[PDB]
Design a protein around this nucleic acid. Structure first.
Ligand code: MG
Ligand code: MG
Ligand code: MG
Ligand code: MG
Ligand code: MG
Ligand code: MG
Ligand code: MG
Ligand code: MG
Ligand code: MG
Ligand code: MG
Ligand code: MG
Ligand code: MG
Ligand code: MG
Ligand code: MG
Ligand code: MG
Ligand code: MG
Ligand code: MG
Ligand code: MG
Ligand code: MG
Ligand code: MG
Ligand code: MG
Ligand code: MG
Ligand code: MG
Ligand code: MG
Ligand code: MG
Ligand code: MG
Ligand code: MG
Ligand code: MG
Ligand code: MG
Ligand code: MG
Ligand code: MG
Ligand code: MG
Ligand code: MG
Ligand code: MG
Ligand code: MG
Ligand code: MG
Ligand code: MG
Ligand code: MG
Ligand code: MG
Ligand code: MG
Ligand code: MG
Ligand code: MG
Ligand code: MG
Ligand code: MG
Ligand code: MG
Ligand code: MG
Ligand code: MG
Ligand code: MG
Ligand code: MG
Ligand code: MG
Ligand code: MG
Ligand code: MG
Ligand code: MG
Ligand code: MG
Ligand code: MG
Ligand code: MG
Ligand code: MG
Ligand code: MG
Ligand code: MG
Ligand code: MG
Ligand code: MG
Ligand code: MG
Ligand code: MG
Ligand code: MG
Ligand code: MG
Ligand code: MG
Ligand code: MG
Ligand code: MG
Ligand code: MG
Ligand code: MG
Ligand code: MG
Ligand code: MG
Ligand code: ZN
Lengths: 105, 48, 47, 112
RNA sequence: CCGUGAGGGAAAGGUGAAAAGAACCCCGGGAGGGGAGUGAAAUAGAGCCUGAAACCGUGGGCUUACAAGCAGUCACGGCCCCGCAAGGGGUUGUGGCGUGCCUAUUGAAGCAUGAGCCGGCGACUCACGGUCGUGGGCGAGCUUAAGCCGUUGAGGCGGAGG
RNA sequence: AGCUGGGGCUAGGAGUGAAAAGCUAACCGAGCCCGGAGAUAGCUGGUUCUCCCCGAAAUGACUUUAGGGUCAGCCUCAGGC
RNA sequence: GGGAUGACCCCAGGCGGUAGGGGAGCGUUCCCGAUGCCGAUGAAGGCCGACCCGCGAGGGCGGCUGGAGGUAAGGGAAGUGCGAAUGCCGGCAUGAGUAACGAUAAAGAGGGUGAGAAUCCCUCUCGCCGUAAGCCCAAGGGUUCCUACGCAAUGGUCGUCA
């Protein structure tokens, strides 16, 4: 039911935090946490036990989810926009009110 | 019947009761062959 | 010494039982109240 | 440099175990080693464990040179007490508390 | 959970922005801990925000084994501490003085009630009438009720009646 | 006029009782639960920050009144003389 | 009286106090002030202070902690101040390492297992039940049965056993 803005296809900008400034592609999107994970932005170090693979290994780097609010869709040519919705026929859209463009895939 | 204490006894008075409660360390002698320590007139844990 | 609970499974279903309660208006109202309070068990559990 | 060990939630009474802790305070690690072995108290076991871990921790972690270790300071604080019901005459039921000790041995280096 | 049953009826919320919830190594049977590592912060480590008090404990300063007491207060002195000193903080040897709090009673230190100690909960209110006082509006007058209209938490109308 | 298992019936001013006001689910001269209910209590207890001023009574009359009250007396505040 | 119509100097007096009457203030929660102001260069809360203001209730300031809130001047409204109620809920003391550890049928040794054994396993000896303390059945109980891996708790000690 939760509406988001960005989806898996998207290229987004991380607009805040340690990773502020960087653009990348949302690798996964978790509506129920209101979180997107953008590979490869937000990386962290998890320690991991010696069972098979990481059978020797003690440390993994993984990319942490981000509050879906922290990121913005890039809009080809810019780094703004928000949302707009064009209808035409029969239905559907995303446009940049920045303006006016894709997503799409 | 059924005697009871009349006053909670003070932190001062219970601690002073305990002035004798302190332990004294075990009585120990060096062992005839091995390096180790033993209570006197006993059979040494090492090299009896 | 002989005490007050001498469990017998027939006596229990015959006395506090569900069909018991339902036979008498006194007892339908027992069930009504228990149901309204939202009791999990409306009536004693005998095996 | 100085090194410690803390045994936590040891099921034994602070009053009881404090007594043996007093036996080995300011002792060279070697006399402390001998005192607890021949002490007869359930708490000589538990202290000896904490003694060692601190001795281990000293050489093995903080690079302390074992032969000069003494017991700088040490003590048992009182952990959270588990309560149980002790049924009694005429229906009565007191509660007795099985208690808890936090044992702490703190080691430092002799100056010789 | 208690009760045969009708029925009674609790406690118990909070790591971090994010699990990044501590791989590995050391003592250990384990629990627990010490290094490592994460983290802005780990006495935020999961018995996890803040973390009071009673209560227990370790270290330090002053002190006490020929004094006797509601435990304090006045004074001088010794020791320790902060400093610019004539200064101030701590402690307390000797000397003066000194019958706990509350309640209830003509009278309580009272050998009369209540209280082990700490934290939190805990008792003169509201409505409509009445009566005085007071701050204002209008004054031979003053004043609307139900309701009607309107309203970003906008007010006005309404004179039955009193 | 025996003891006993199992199955039944009788109950709250009611039952039952070789009779003690015994027993009726560990307190029966009238069971327990929930409710009228925050019954009533002329009685006992308790009543929570600070400073300033003033400052009583424990008597009289009536009282199914006597450790409760109503009026008077004595306190206090405002205005007046 | 000072004539400043005063917030103020001078002079003169009064100021023990329970039931009570009266008056001025402090503080707590909340609202208007507020689309503001304080705040991560650190809010509320906490811990200290020998410092400053107030007669006092209180208010400041400073340091430490804490880490996301607070809320002036002026005014408004209350679930507004606790030491006592054999009060209520919780927490922690004292008695105290004290009484007990629940049938006086009774134990000893060797060996095994295990980090750890008076308490588990085996052997041997000893003791106690035997119209029972043995064995069957009915209630009632409800997986307690069997076996493997366990010992935080439960077991009035211990436990490797249950
Ligand atoms: Mg019989
Ligand atoms: Mg019972
Ligand atoms: Mg049957
Ligand atoms: Mg259900
Ligand atoms: Mg007993
Ligand atoms: Mg019993
Ligand atoms: Mg107790
Ligand atoms: Mg039941
Ligand atoms: Mg959080
Ligand atoms: Mg740590
Ligand atoms: Mg802290
Ligand atoms: Mg913290
Ligand atoms: Mg805690
Ligand atoms: Mg927080
Ligand atoms: Mg904490
Ligand atoms: Mg000390
Ligand atoms: Mg003499
Ligand atoms: Mg002397
Ligand atoms: Mg004196
Ligand atoms: Mg009292
Ligand atoms: Mg009295
Ligand atoms: Mg009297
Ligand atoms: Mg009298
Ligand atoms: Mg007395
Ligand atoms: Mg008396
Ligand atoms: Mg008294
Ligand atoms: Mg209190
Ligand atoms: Mg009124
Ligand atoms: Mg009025
Ligand atoms: Mg008027
Ligand atoms: Mg309308
Ligand atoms: Mg029969
Ligand atoms: Mg029957
Ligand atoms: Mg029968
Ligand atoms: Mg019947
Ligand atoms: Mg009758
Ligand atoms: Mg008979
Ligand atoms: Mg009953
Ligand atoms: Mg009876
Ligand atoms: Mg009756
Ligand atoms: Mg009656
Ligand atoms: Mg009524
Ligand atoms: Mg009442
Ligand atoms: Mg009556
Ligand atoms: Mg009453
Ligand atoms: Mg009359
Ligand atoms: Mg009376
Ligand atoms: Mg009168
Ligand atoms: Mg004067
Ligand atoms: Mg006065
Ligand atoms: Mg006077
Ligand atoms: Mg910061
Ligand atoms: Mg607040
Ligand atoms: Mg602060
Ligand atoms: Mg405010
Ligand atoms: Mg105000
Ligand atoms: Mg209140
Ligand atoms: Mg009081
Ligand atoms: Mg004694
Ligand atoms: Mg004795
Ligand atoms: Mg004994
Ligand atoms: Mg015995
Ligand atoms: Mg072996
Ligand atoms: Mg072995
Ligand atoms: Mg025989
Ligand atoms: Mg069966
Ligand atoms: Mg059972
Ligand atoms: Mg089971
Ligand atoms: Mg079995
Ligand atoms: Mg087994
Ligand atoms: Mg166990
Ligand atoms: Mg045990
Ligand atoms: Zn554009």
């Amino acid at each position: 039911r939760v509406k988001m803005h960005v989806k898996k296809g998207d290229t987004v900008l991380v607009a805040s935090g340690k990773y502020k400034g960087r653009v990348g592609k949302v690798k996964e999107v978790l509506p129920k946490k209101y979180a997107v994970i953008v590979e490869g932005v937000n990386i962290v170090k998890k320690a991991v036990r010696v069972s098979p693979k990481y059978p020797q290994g003690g440390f993994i780097e993984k990319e942490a989810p981000l509050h879906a609010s922290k990121v913005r869709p890039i809009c080809p040519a810019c780094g703004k926009p928000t949302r707009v919705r064009k209808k035409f026929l029969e239905n559907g859209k995303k446009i940049r009110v920045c303006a006016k463009c894709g997503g799409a895939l | 019947k059924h005697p009871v204490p009349k006053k909670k006894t003070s932190k001062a008075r219970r601690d002073a009761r305990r002035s004798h409660h302190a332990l004294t360390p075990p009585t120990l002698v060096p062992c005839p062959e091995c390096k180790a320590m033993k209570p006197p007139h006993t059979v040494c844990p090492e090299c009896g | 010494m002989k005490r007050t609970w001498q469990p017998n499974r027939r006596k229990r279903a015959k006395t506090h039982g569900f069909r018991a309660r339902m036979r008498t208006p006194g007892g339908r109202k027992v069930l009504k109240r228990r149901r309204q309070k939202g009791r999990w068990r409306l009536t004693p559990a005998v095996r | 440099m100085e090194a410690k060990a803390i045994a936590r939630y040891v099921r034994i009474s602070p009053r009881k175990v404090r007594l043996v802790v007093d036996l080995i305070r300011g002792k060279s690690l070697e006399e402390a080693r001998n005192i607890l072995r021949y002490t007869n108290k359930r708490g000589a076991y538990f202290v000896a464990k904490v003694l060692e871990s601190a001795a281990a921790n000293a050489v093995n972690n903080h690079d302390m040179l074992e032969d000069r270790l003494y017991v700088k300071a040490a003590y048992v604080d009182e952990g959270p007490a588990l309560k149980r019901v002790l049924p009694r005459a005429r229906g009565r039921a007191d509660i007795i508390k099985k208690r808890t000790s936090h044992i702490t041995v703190i080691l430092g280096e002799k100056h010789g």
